Design a protein around this ligand. Structure first.
Ligand SMILES: [K+]
Ligand SMILES: [K+]
Ligand SMILES: [Zn+2]
Length: 209
């Protein structure tokens, strides 16, 4: 039954218009979000609610396990539009604990097409296998890998010419890594924020145009 969703929407919109009848008309007139949210598709991690933001505040991309790949024009086009056209001040890379995408990459079952999508997380598990082997429970390994994945995606975002060229032309932009707890509702900083060229390894730094 879809009728519930339509009815929900009619009531939501009418409720907002009673408190402020111009709410939508005003929002529709320009696009000025200050944040881009890059997170997981997981239904339990909706961006606006988690950080108490309103329509118009958060430009959003969501994919399975919040992965930022250097040849993915889907995610890269969101970033590029956000950085170049909307001039968002912050990119919030948010992963979450218990992530199914991350969990599947630690196991050996074929899930299909998504196997290729997640293989970068598999590389990370291999890269940190000596660290992950040390952890006694699977939930612990999954959760730590969730963290490692966010930190890696922050690096990936920061390495794009999109972000570097913004810095080159003096634009203020920070890439943050956070992780959401589906068990406790808490959005936690991983403290891996990058805000300028001087923080990138030399191997990744691109010269200005
Ligand atoms: K879900
Ligand atoms: K800089
Ligand atoms: Zn997830």
């Amino acid at each position: 039954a879809l009728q519930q969703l339509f009815e929900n929407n009619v009531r939501w919109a009418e409720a907002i218009k009673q408190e402020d009848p111009d709410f939508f008309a005003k929002l529709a007139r320009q696009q000025t979000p200050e944040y881009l949210w890059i997170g997981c598709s997981d239904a339990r991690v909706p961006a606006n609610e988690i950080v108490g933001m309103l329509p118009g505040d958060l430009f959003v991309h969501r994919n399975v396990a919040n992965v930022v790949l250097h040849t993915d024009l889907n995610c890269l086009s969101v970033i590029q539009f956000a950085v170049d056209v909307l001039k968002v001040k912050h990119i919030l890379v948010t992963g979450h604990y218990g992530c199914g995408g991350v969990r599947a990459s630690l196991h050996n079952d074929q899930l299909g097409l998504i196997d290729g999508w997640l293989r970068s997380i598999r590389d990370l598990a291999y890269e940190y296998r000596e660290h992950l082997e040390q952890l006694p429970t699977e939930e612990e390994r999954v959760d730590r890998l969730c963290e490692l994945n966010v930190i890696q995606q922050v690096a990936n975002v920061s390495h794009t010419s999109i972000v570097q060229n913004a810095w080159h032309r003096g634009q203020s932009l920070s890439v943050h890594g956070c992780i959401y707890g589906i068990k406790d509702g808490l959005w936690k900083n991983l403290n891996v924020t990058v805000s300028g060229l001087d923080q990138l390894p030399p191997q990744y730094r691109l010269s200005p145009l």
